[PDB]
């Protein structure tokens, strides 16, 4: 029992594209002549850009941060540890899911579309029908490939900018009580305990006090 059928076999999927057969019966995905169509949702993987943050002055990523995309790593007399940033990760997740949904909703489903038969004295209309089919297939393949190619680059630049914005925020908060030593870290001129680190991460660092 199935919902989509092709002369080669039945299809059981929810993806928006397929490359099995142009002839379908039922509710089937759009047919393209492509071989690969993968859409990026995460950032560049460096286990061990336009804005120069990812693989720029921050050379590599952290495998110890598991609950987010961007975050902090602290170390003081109490101890060291990682901590993800929730607001930036939430905004990035909202944007990426919105982008994927927009991509999905712009490609409508394919309905029943079967071939026709012509006699030996009807070659002109047969050729016209074949030409129409081939032209539409080529146009849609081009559209899909171009869309994926552009959106991947946009996503990567999005993440690269999101990292640098957080870096600039933290730098602005630590005007003169911290020293910029490169690689994305700041070294404190005073004693910053757990409460001070929490205040730095929250966004309400008390500059006059320290």
């Amino acid at each position, epitope marked *: 029992d199935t919902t989509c059928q092709t002369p080669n076999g039945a299809i059981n999927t*929810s*993806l928006p594209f397929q490359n099995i057969h142009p002839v379908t019966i039922g509710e089937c995905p759009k047919y393209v002549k492509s071989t690969k169509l993968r859409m990026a*949702t*995460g950032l560049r993987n460096i286990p061990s850009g336009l804005f120069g943050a990812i693989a720029g002055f921050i050379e590599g990523g952290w495998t110890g941060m*598991i*609950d987010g995309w961007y975050g902090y790593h602290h170390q003081n007399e109490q101890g060291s540890g990682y901590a993800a940033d*929730l607001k930036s*990760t*939430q905004n990035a*997740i*909202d944007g*990426i*899911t*919105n982008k*994927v*949904n927009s991509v*999905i*909703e712009k490609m409508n489903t394919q309905f029943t579309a079967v071939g026709k038969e012509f006699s030996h004295l009807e070659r002109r209309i047969e050729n016209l029908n074949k030409k129409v089919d081939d032209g539409f297939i080529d146009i849609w393949t081009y559209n899909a490939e171009l869309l994926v190619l552009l959106e991947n680059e946009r996503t990567l630049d999005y993440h690269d900018s999101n990292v640098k914005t957080l870096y600039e925020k933290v730098r602005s908060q630590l005007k003169n009580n911290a020293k910029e030593i490169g690689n994305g870290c700041f070294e404190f001129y005073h004693k910053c305990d757990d409460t001070c680190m929490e205040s730095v991460k929250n966004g309400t660092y008390d500059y006059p006090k320290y």
Partner: antibody, heavy 118, light 109 residues
Framework: VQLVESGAEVKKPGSSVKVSCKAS????????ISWVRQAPGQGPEWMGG????????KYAPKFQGRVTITADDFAGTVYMELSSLRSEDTAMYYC??????????????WGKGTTVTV | VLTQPPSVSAAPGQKVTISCSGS????????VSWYQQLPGTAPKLLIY???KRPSGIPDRFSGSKSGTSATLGITGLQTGDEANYYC????????????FGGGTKLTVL
């Protein structure tokens, strides 16, 4: 956002039951989804939940080892399967959504639920 | 595990307070949420972030936390407020998991 579960289930001791939850809107979600059960005349209990994009799943230690939570993203569906079913597993089941992408105590939208009987 | 009084009763038009007492591992270092459940219906969120109210909740419901114990307060008691009230928290030390309260039955006269 509306969360709808499947129909009622009546099974036998030692079986395995898989239930589903479907959410309205776009197929891709930006919030975590958890499963909560309630016994007759008892308070609610939390089994576990699933996180978007990252895909990590968390479970309670009481149900650890015999509950599995998966998600079909393109269909917008979330499945929870309970195995080694026993007499006490009869209950009233809900799928609840959170405010953010992380599993927490704050569930703001609940489904109608489905009944599981042995 | 969080503990609440089993039942509280009062006349209509009065003010009631329900306590949720835990330990330093659940309430003393994390926020507390308050849910309301009617017979035959799924629990409904009343209070989150220990004092914040979602859209649609009447002003007369309020909440607070003082150390290891949280409190929920209802004013202008009505006949439709007779339900079960639960406190939930994110216990996190061995393996973090949502913990619900023991439950409190509020009865109107």
């Amino acid at each position: 956002v509306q969360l709808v579960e499947s129909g009622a289930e009546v099974k036998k001791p030692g079986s395995s039951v898989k239930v589903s939850c479907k959410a309205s809107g776009g197929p891709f979600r930006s919030y975590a989804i958890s499963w909560v059960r309630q016994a007759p005349g008892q308070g609610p209990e939390w089994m576990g939940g699933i996180i978007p994009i990252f895909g990590t799943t968390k479970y309670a230690p009481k149900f650890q080892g015999r509950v599995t939570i998966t998600a079909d993203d393109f269909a917008g569906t979330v499945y929870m399967e309970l195995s080694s079913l026993r007499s006490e597993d009869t209950a009233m089941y809900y799928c609840a959504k959170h405010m953010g992408y992380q599993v927490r105590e704050t569930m703001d939208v609940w489904g109608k639920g489905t009944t599981v009987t042995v | 595990v969080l503990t609440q009084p089993p039942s509280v009763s009062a006349a209509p038009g009065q003010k009631v307070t329900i306590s949720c007492s835990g330990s330093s591992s659940n309430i003393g270092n994390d926020y507390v949420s308050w849910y309301q459940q009617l017979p035959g219906t799924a629990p409904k969120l009343l209070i989150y972030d220990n004092n914040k109210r979602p859209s649609g909740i009447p002003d007369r419901f309020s909440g607070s936390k003082s150390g290891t114990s949280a409190t929920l307060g209802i004013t202008g008691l009505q006949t439709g407020d007779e339900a079960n009230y639960y406190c939930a928290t994110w216990d996190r030390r061995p393996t973090a998991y949502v913990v619900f309260g023991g439950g409190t039955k509020l009865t109107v006269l």
